[model samples]
Target: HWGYGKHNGPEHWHKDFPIAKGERQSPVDIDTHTAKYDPSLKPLSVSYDQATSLRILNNGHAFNVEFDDSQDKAVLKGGPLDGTYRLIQFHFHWGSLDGQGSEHTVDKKKYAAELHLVHWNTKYGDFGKAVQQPDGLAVLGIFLKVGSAKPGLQKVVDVLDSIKTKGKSADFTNFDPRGLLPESLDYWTYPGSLTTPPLLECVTWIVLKEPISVSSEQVLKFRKLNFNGEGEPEELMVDNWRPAQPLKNRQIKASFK
Candidate 1:
């Protein structure tokens, strides 16, 4: 199996999944000088009802906040999207050390962490089928800086203690996903793939320019997690971010200049 470790890491992914070598792989470095400004891009519209939050799970690879996407209770619209994209789950990627955890970088600048809010286009009907289509998924990427503690993130951090091991999960409800967002919606959009396995090149990546803040103390909480289960020999879950891939002639569109 593929993992972000010395044995079977990103460098060895192409051996098992050929798509890892594909042109549109994600976590690319955003070069502002080349990105085209598209004034036509509409402001992103996010509608998330706090009650839609279902549970928080430690899936071994990363911790995810799952949502009840049976309906349009939580959805992202506009901003380079053709139709509504339903919010299915949200997760994070970080490194063991500070100042270098983010998957994507801006002009070679990396942040303390990155947050990925995964959504699938409703026009495709289902996430499983949607993932394979060209415009099926739209992921909102928010960079996290190491500074003051984010009040909105306290609820999530507080629960990490209970889900320290793989396959651990607990009921989590009434948490508004919007609380995690920054004041500015200005972003850079491009075609990309999933940072993880089966690296599908079907995502419309909307990466925010403004980053949310989190304290150094809070940043270390993610490291406390274990990749293995409770009984298995514990391996610290850190540095799970995939290295940045080549841009490959793709044009990055910006909502603002």
Candidate 2:
């Protein structure tokens, strides 16, 4: 199984997954100085149904809140997208420490954590099929800063106790992911890949400029989740983030100046 350990970590992923070495890999450092201000970019349009939330699962990699994407009940439009993209799931990548977790960085500044809301283009059908196409996935990246307590996150954190081990899952519904977002939808956009193995280059990354606040107590719960499944030597799940990849020739366009 792939993990954040040295042998199975990002640096060794290319040995098994060749695409790990592919260009357009994700979690690239967004150099604001070099990024272009594209006035043509549209404001993000999100319409999410609270009922679309299905369940939550601990997939040994990260804890994911799955959504019912059978129809366009919840979808994202505009913001560098040609058509609508349906929300499939949302997960997070964090570290044991405060300053070194987020996958995407702005001018080499790493935040306390990063949240990824994964969506797939409707043009390509289901998320499984769309993941391989060029204009397939759209992942909204939200950075988390440690500060005041976030009551909005309590609902998500409460379920962590039920899914403390790998492969564990629990029913999680009536949650609107929109509540977790910042007031400003202004963001940076670029073409990139999934930050994990079989890293497909199909995501239109929309990374928000402003970070949402979460208290240290709230962020600490994520570290308590174990990476190994039942009966295996327990390994705390933390620092499950991929290091920033090289930004070859991609231009990061911004929705705001």
Candidate 3:
């Protein structure tokens, strides 16, 4: 019912989801001068050595590479999170032009795109129970820049042709998602909502300081994806990102000084 179209975009979401005006909304601009460096923050601990992927699909907005989270094989345990969070699914948000696509900004600087690794808290018992809780989800955001070609990202891009239209899916198992992460894990974290609707305010966002590189050609592959459903005249999926919301009373904490 909700989408990233002009008629159904972020500006119009508040009509159905009032939480769009919530204070803890996601993708806030990280003013480096304002982000307090917390010494107490631990380095992020991630283990994707045994990650189990299931499929890849274009779900009307952005394409997603989903993981098999029925077990604890791939998990994120440390950082600003308590208890382990199981890796669920991952996706990207990009713009028609490479300069402005990322949801979260750094010093008012937007990136080519952003990679979100969605995870659910193990304490919640399941994702259904988790989404309703304030501290039930932790998303790792890795920004993307247009520079050199990334082999890790190319793997996913090569398969986009299979799922070019909305609801299109293909078997995409046995892939390790960790390869997509940048070398540095230093990040800024804050309590925020899911960028999309129902815009649930359940996520603890961990946005990486270092951005990974992706080729211009690779980015074009993502823009080629359709936002419309099968046989719906093929509207190119560009600008799938939600604009950065207000910071309000929230504070941005950094892992690096």
C-alpha local distance difference test of each model: 0.92, 0.91, 0.92
Candidate 3 lDDT over residue span 73-183, tens digit each: 889988899999999999999999988999999999999999999999999999888999999899999999999988888879999998999999999988889789999
TM-score of each: 0.98, 0.98, 0.98
- Candidate 3 pairs with clashing backbones: none
Question: Cα-based RMSD of the predictions, in order?
Answer: 1.0, 1.0, 0.8
List, residue by residue over 105-221, the lDDT tens digit for candidate 1: 999898889999999999989999999898999999999998899999989999999999999999988888788999999999999999999899999999999999998888889
TM-score of 3: 0.98
By TM-score, the best candidate is 3
Better of 1 and 2 by lDDT: 1
Worst 10 residues of 3 by lDDT: 1-10
Error of 2 at 94 (Å): 0.2
Model 3 ranges off by over 4 Å: none
Model 2 residue 169 lDDT?
Answer: 97
Prediction-by-prediction clash tally: 0, 0, 0
